[PDB]
Design an enzyme around this catalytic site. Structure first.
Site, PDB file in Angstrom:
ATOM      1  N   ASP A  35      16.273 105.536  44.052  1.00  0.00           N
ATOM      2  CA  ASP A  35      17.368 104.678  44.495  1.00  0.00           C
ATOM      3  C   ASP A  35      18.715 105.200  44.009  1.00  0.00           C
ATOM      4  OD1 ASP A  35      18.990 102.654  45.318  1.00  0.00           O
ATOM      5  OD2 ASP A  35      18.248 101.162  43.861  1.00  0.00           O
ATOM      6  N   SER A 199      33.983 108.222  54.637  1.00  0.00           N
ATOM      7  CA  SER A 199      33.751 108.818  55.938  1.00  0.00           C
ATOM      8  C   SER A 199      35.051 108.869  56.730  1.00  0.00           C
ATOM      9  CB  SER A 199      32.692 108.004  56.679  1.00  0.00           C
ATOM     10  OG  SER A 199      32.534 108.425  58.021  1.00  0.00           O
TER      11      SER A 199
END
EC number: 3.4.23.22
Length: 330
Positions: A35, A199
């Site tokens: 994770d 992004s």
């Protein structure tokens, strides 16, 4: 040193991925959920409340000659999906794909929430976010990666998740045969303890690319792609009959649909998520309403590039002094 381990989807929807991990002496092999959105290595154990164990393999520290109680240390964690676990702590030898760390904090669960009990395939989590998020008190502990780092050939790990297929976690090297083209690196902020990056925009299907900054985290422990409501609405608007359902808990679409791809930007590079990756199947067994793999982050408080996004790429988690993230097509 290096390590290399295969990671395998737990079910037919790629809800999560498990990777075998050797703990203790002689080795006890547990299948852990790696994770990159948390920083605790915790396991089902001989200390876990019996009624909360249902099929998991447990770690038994009393059977390990290298286990030592970390006296006084406790831990307690809550995840974004509302699940939780807590317990006490041992140090022991932990190996992943041939890479060994001695003195790793292994957090033994005394209690786990229902979601963990109900998932017989996941024997615990191995956190790969920054150690500043580790929950051990009163002495915070380091992740497996942080402990291994100085011994690694290069201070990196890579995630290469498969779509309905196994993939690979590598530690300490970049497998240049595992991706196509070049890797594009992008800046990381560690301010919140995550692999947080920005992004450069998105496209829906064959549509034009929208240049827009989207801050979010690379999180292998989250199944879906969670993005701003504006972006998600633009995506689902291209699917006939798609709608957000408060009763179901997100966007659903007719199972008869063909889904468009979704592109996200990494610098001037582009990662394309095929439409099929965005199909999470019937909302309930036999339903003709299907659950979407792109969902709104509104009310989460953060955008999350979960498995839906990450599995479309070869992803480098660069833990050098100035951390960065790399993405390549594959």
């Amino acid at each position: 040193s290096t390590g290399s381990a295969t990671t395998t989807p737990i079910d037919s929807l790629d809800d999560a991925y498990i990777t075998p991990v050797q703990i203790g002496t002689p080795a006890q092999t547990l299948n852990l959920d790696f994770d990159t959105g948390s920083s605790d290595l915790w396991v089902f154990s001989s200390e876990t409340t019996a009624s909360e164990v249902d099929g998991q393999t447990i770690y038994t520290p009393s059977k390990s000659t290298t286990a030592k109680l970390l006296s006084g240390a406790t831990w307690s964690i809550s995840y974004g999906d509302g699940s939780s676990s807590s317990g006490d702590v041992y140090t022991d030898t932990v190996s992943v794909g041939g890479l060994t760390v001695t003195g790793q904090a292994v957090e033994s669960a005394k209690k786990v929430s229902s979601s963990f009990t109900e998932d017989s395939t996941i024997d615990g989590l191995l956190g790969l976010a920054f150690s500043t998020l580790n929950t051990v008190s009163p002495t915070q502990q380091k992740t497996f990666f942080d402990n291994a780092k100085a011994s690694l050939d290069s201070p990196v790990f890579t995630a290469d998740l498969g779509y309905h297929a196994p993939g690979t976690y590598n530690f300490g090297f970049i497998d240049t045969t595992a991706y196509t083209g070049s890797i594009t690196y992008t800046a990381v902020s560690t301010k919140q303890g995550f692999w947080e990056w920005t992004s450069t925009g998105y496209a829906v299907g064959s549509g034009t690319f929208k240049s827009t900054s989207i801050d979010g985290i690379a999180d292998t422990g989250t199944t879906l792609l969670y993005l701003p409501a504006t972006v998600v609405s633009a995506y689902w608007a291209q699917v006939s009959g798609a709608k957000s359902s408060s009763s179901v808990g997100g966007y659903v679409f007719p199972c008869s649909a063909t889904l468009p791809s979704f592109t996200f930007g990494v610098g001037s590079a582009r990662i394309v998520i095929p439409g099929d990756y965005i199909d999470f199947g019937p909302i309930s067994t036999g339903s003709s309403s299907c659950f979407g793999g792109i969902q709104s982050s509104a009310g989460i408080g953060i955008n999350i590039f979960g498995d839906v996004a990450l599995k479309a790429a070869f992803v480098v988690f660069n833990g050098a002094t100035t951390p960065t993230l790399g993405f390549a097509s594959k």
